[PDB]
């Protein structure tokens, strides 16, 4: 019943994308911010980082029982052999989709775009982040599409490090005038040993360590023990 490596890995990718989409459209109101999958012998565990953990778990875990009741009936998980976990996000300034969903459900509640954008900006740069770009395009008011940018701090715009030092989230807002498209790009400062930013330093920059002092006696001396 075995299947090739390419097909099984693409199936795992399909499965993960399916979970991502379902949980993003299902728990965006409850601040869903990420899904991870681990495997133990004859057991699959799924841990869901969320901004609002009290709203992603529910009373007595019932929603989780509901949640596993849904997933187990889609991807082929036999009844009672799958468990769902959730951890609070360490900081909302290391993930872009969290602030993306925050912007969604701040504008969907009825709110000037600028106020929410500036609130997110000050939240991000009180989080020690090194740069935040919130681009909002659509019709802010009237009947014309103007793209506005809320740009704070420096941010890398090219190269390899954009893979890890920059985290990006795209989102759509559905108001009664139309659709507002946002992109949130958050740069991660250098935090080796501590998991806030990337562990590796910025590849193009060089730092020279402070000098080591000298002790140069003019008259040679020996140090017996």
């Amino acid at each position: 019943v075995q299947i090739s490596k390419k097909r099984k890995f693409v199936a795992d990718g399909i499965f993960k994308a399916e979970l991502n989409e379902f949980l993003t459209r299902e728990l965006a109101e409850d601040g869903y911010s990420g899904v991870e999958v681990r495997v133990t012998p004859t057991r699959t565990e799924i841990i869901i980082l969320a901004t609002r953990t009290q709203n992603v778990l529910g009373e007595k875990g019932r929603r989780i029982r509901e949640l596993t009741a849904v997933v187990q009936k889609r991807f082929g998980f036999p009844e009672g052999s799958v468990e769902l976990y959730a951890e609070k996000v360490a900081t909302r300034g290391l993930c872009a989709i969290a602030q993306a969903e925050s912007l969604r459900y701040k504008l969907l509640g009825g709110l000037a775009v600028r106020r929410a954008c500036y609130g997110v900006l000050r939240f991000i740069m009180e989080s020690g982040a090194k740069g935040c770009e919130v681009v909002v395009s659509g019709k802010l008011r009237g009947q014309r599409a103007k793209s506005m940018k809320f740009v704070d701090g420096l941010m890398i715009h090219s190269g390899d490090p954009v893979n890890y030092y920059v985290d990006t989230a795209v989102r759509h807002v559905l108001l009664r005038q139309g659709v507002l498209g946002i992109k949130v790009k958050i740069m991660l400062p250098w935090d080796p040993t501590g998991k806030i930013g990337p562990k590796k330093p910025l590849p193009d920059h060089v730092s020279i360590v402070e000098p080591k002092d000298e002790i140069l006696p003019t008259t040679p001396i020996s140090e017996q023990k």
């Binding site: 000037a112 600028r114 106020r115 500036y118 506005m148």
Partner: peptide, 30 residues
């Protein structure tokens, strides 16, 4: 709503005078 932000965005719009007045209210007086 932060009137500094409202002035930054809407100063050149139909509500430029109103956001200017609100900004001046916030800037001095407390």
């Amino acid at each position: 709503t932060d009137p500094i932000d409202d002035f930054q965005v809407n100063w050149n719009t139909k509500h430029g005078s109103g956001v200017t007045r609100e900004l001046m209210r916030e800037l001095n007086g407390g």
